[PDB]
Amino acid sequence: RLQRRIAQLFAEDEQVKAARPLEAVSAAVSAPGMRLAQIAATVMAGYADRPAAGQRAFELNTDDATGRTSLRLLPRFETITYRELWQRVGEVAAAWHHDPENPLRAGDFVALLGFTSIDYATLDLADIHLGAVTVPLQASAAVSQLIAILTETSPRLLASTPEHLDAAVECLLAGTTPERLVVFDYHPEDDDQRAAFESARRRLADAGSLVIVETLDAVRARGRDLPAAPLFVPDTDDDPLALLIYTSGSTGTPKGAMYTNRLAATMWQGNSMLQGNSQRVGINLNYMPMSHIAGRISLFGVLARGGTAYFAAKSDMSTLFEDIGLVRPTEIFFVPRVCDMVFQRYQSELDRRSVAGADLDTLDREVKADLRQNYLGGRFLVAVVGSAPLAAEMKTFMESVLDLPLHDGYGSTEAGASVLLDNQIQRPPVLDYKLVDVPELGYFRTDRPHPRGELLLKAETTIPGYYKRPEVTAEIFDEDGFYKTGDIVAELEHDRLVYVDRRNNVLKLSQGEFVTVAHLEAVFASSPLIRQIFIYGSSERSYLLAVIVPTDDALRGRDTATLKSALAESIQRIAKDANLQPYEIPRDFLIETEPFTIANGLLSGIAKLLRPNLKERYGAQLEQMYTDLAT
Numbered sequence: 327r328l329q330r331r332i333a334q335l336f337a338e339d340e341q342v343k344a345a346r347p348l349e350a351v352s353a354a355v356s357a358p359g360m361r362l363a364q365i366a367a368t369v370m371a372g373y374a375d376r377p378a379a380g381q382r383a384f385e386l387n388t389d390d391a392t393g394r395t396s397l398r399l400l401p402r403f404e405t406i407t408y409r410e411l412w413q414r415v416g417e418v419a420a421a422w423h424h425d426p427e428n429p430l431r432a433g434d435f436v437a438l439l440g441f442t443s444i445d446y447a448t449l450d451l452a453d454i455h456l457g458a459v460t461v462p463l464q465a466s467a468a469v470s471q472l473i474a475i476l477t478e479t480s481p482r483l484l485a486s487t488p489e490h491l492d493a494a495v496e497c498l499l500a501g502t503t504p505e506r507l508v509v510f511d512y513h514p515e516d517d518d519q520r521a522a523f524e525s526a527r528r529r530l531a532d533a534g535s536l537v538i539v540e541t542l543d544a545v546r547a548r549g550r551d552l553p554a555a556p557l558f559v560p561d562t563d564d565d566p567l568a569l570l571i572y573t574s575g576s577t578g579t580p581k582g583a584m585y586t587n588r589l590a591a592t593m594w595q596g597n598s599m600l601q602g603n604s605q606r607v608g609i610n611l612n613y614m615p616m617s618h619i620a621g622r623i624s625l626f627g628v629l630a631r632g633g634t635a636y637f638a639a640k641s642d643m644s645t646l647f648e649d650i651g652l653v654r655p656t657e658i659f660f661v662p663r664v665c666d667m668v669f670q671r672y673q674s675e676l677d678r679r680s681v682a683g684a685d686l687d688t689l690d691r692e693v694k695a696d697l698r699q700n701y702l703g704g705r706f707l708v709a710v711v712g713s714a715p716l717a718a719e720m721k722t723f724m725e726s727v728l729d730l731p732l733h734d735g736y737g738s739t740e741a742g743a744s745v746l747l748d749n750q751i752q753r754p755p756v757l758d759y760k761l762v763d764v765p766e767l768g769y770f771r772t773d774r775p776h777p778r779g780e781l782l783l784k785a786e787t788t789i790p791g792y793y794k795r796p797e798v799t800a801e802i803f804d805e806d807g808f809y810k811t812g813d814i815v816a817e818l819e820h821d822r823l824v825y826v827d828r829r830n831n832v833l834k835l836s837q838g839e840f841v842t843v844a845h846l847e848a849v850f851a852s853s854p855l856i857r858q859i860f861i862y863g864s865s866e867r868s869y870l871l872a873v874i875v876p877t878d879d880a881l882r883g884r885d886t887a888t889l890k891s892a893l894a895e896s897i898q899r900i901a902k903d904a905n906l907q908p909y910e911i912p913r914d915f916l917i918e919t920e921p922f923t924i925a926n927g928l929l930s931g932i933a934k935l936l937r938p939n940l941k942e943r944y945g946a947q948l949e950q951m952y953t954d955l956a957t
């Protein structure tokens with residue numbers, strides 16, 4: 327089936343045919359001495375006349391009752407070519423390099439606060455063009471954390487989308503180093519965005535700040551009237567810092583993972599099997615933020631193949647399936663949250679269509695085909711899931727919907743994106759690994775069917791450490807230079823590993839049994855009644871609780887007691903299918919009707935649960951539930 331789809335595609339679909347990578351360009355990009363900016367330059371020249379990037383079309387609607395004008399999204403995308411994108415980059419790079427008073431120099435830090443967009447890419451590529459160090463701030467971060475990062479990095483420039491200007495201005499009023507505030511993704515005919523921009527300008531002026539607040543459009547206009555900027559190419563023996571990717575773990579404090587010029591280059595053309603992908607057509611919907619490695623690889627990896635990178639219209643996945651259905655990408659990268667959304671759409675549709683006359687011999691297949699064709703676009707050739715665990719049942723469901731394999735990719739900000747693919751160690755980039763016993767969590771080389779322990783890694787893609795964090799950096803490498811992943815794995819055989827959970831997520835119950843709470847959250851995602859779930863336990867208790875956000879369908883026509891009974895029954899079925907032990911099953915739960923979001927601090931920018939924030943939010947209620955059940 328797949329092979330026939332591909333043949334039809336490459337015979338009838340002119341968009342796909344025109345986007346086929348050029349072997350000659352990929353060869354040039356691969357050349358041994360190519361540095362980061364040269365890769366960018368070579369790609370843009372090589373694919374000049376092709377569509378490179380796309381964003382939702384929009385119009386400006388004026389409500390005559392409020393008199394207010396608002397940007398409204400239209401059901402189509404518009405593109406710009408490689409030539410056009412590189413022209414924009416060149417204008418920015420010229421504006422920054424040839425500035426009469428205070429030009430930017432290689433090694434200077436530039437902070438960017440946004441999502442992922444044509445403008446974001448423009449700014450990011452301009453940093454690369456000049457050898458500036460990009461600091462892609464996590465939009466999920468609290469202002470105090472943003473200020474701490476700015477203090478650490480002392481950037482000379484801050485760029486922000488209008489949605490984040492309130493945060494940007496607070497950062498600048500706190501006396502941080504940026505000399506200019508560049509507003510991008512900016513539509514001045516939208517009254518809300520114009521208000522945000524004018525407020526920023528007014529507030530900084532009122533404070534007596536010397537910061538210059540300007541639009542990206544104005545920066546480009548200035549650059550248009552200047553000579554071309556030099557392309558930064560480091561000494562053959564040098565590998566300067568190019569990028570910091572901030573990441574947070576046990577202690578919620580963000581650390582800046584150091585990406586050198588060479589490490590950042592792997593995001594364009596990697597060396598692994600999946601980041602190699604050299605001849606696959608790359609028509610992509612980018613919905614992960616540029617503040618995450620996955621978002622960067624999604625953009626740069628597609629540009630390196632002369633494909634077309636389409637940007638999702640919103641950062642909270644609220645337009646995701648509209649966007650994917652319009653773009654009809656040839657490849658899709660899933661995070662488990664998105665798989666959940668596909669499953670939840672499937673369940674809603676199946677339930678709705680399961681009427682008296684329905685042929686249940688066939689309805690399941692129809693609903694999945696609807697998802698495959700109309701929600702996922704029907705043109706994808708490959709699919710990958712990563713960033714968090716996907717449970718076996720959900721993986722089987724997804725493969726049934728996709729009608730092709732869902733590759734599981736394991737990696738990290740520290741170690742590299744390509745560590746495991748379908749449980750196989752990837753060489754390159756991996757050089758060596760070992761498992762280390764974790765006695766306190768009951769994981770040993772001598773275990774049940776398979777050795778278990780913490781994964782320690784050597785790889786070409788490991789970071790040198792975290793920016794200005796000497797002690798933390800010392801603690802993440804062992805005495806033989808292995809990076810300590812903090813992740814528990816099971817070793818099926820040499821180079822074949824199964825991810826278990828993060829060490830941090832392993833909980834010992836009062837009876838002595840260990841539970842892996844993120845793994846379990848993934849298992850229960852398969853309940854048709856659960857929209858989201860957070861599992862919580864206490865080492866002083868013998869059983870687990872959960873905070874459950876029910877689906878809208880689950881809530882309909884039920885009171886709390888009946889809803890809890892329904893959820894308990896579904897959890898029981900899921901647990902039996904997944905062969906769980908009794909202690910791995912949540913026994914009681916908090917019903918939460920407000921979903922976890924980026925905005926309320928409970929999801930990350932890639933839609934992973936923020937466990938420290940969930941515990942802060944629900945911990946007191948959950949502990950009270952333990953006592954109330956006790957009494």
Ligand SMILES: Nc1ncnc2c1ncn2[C@@H]1O[C@H](COP(=O)(O)O)[C@@H](O)[C@H]1O
Pocket residue numbers: 573619711712713714715716734735736737738739740811813825827828
């Ligand atoms: N395929 C995967 N399966 C399970 N967990 C994963 C997978 N990929 C990444 N992770 C988790 O995500 C962490 C790294 O997240 P990040 O540095 O933000 O890229 C890892 O240490 C794992 O806990």
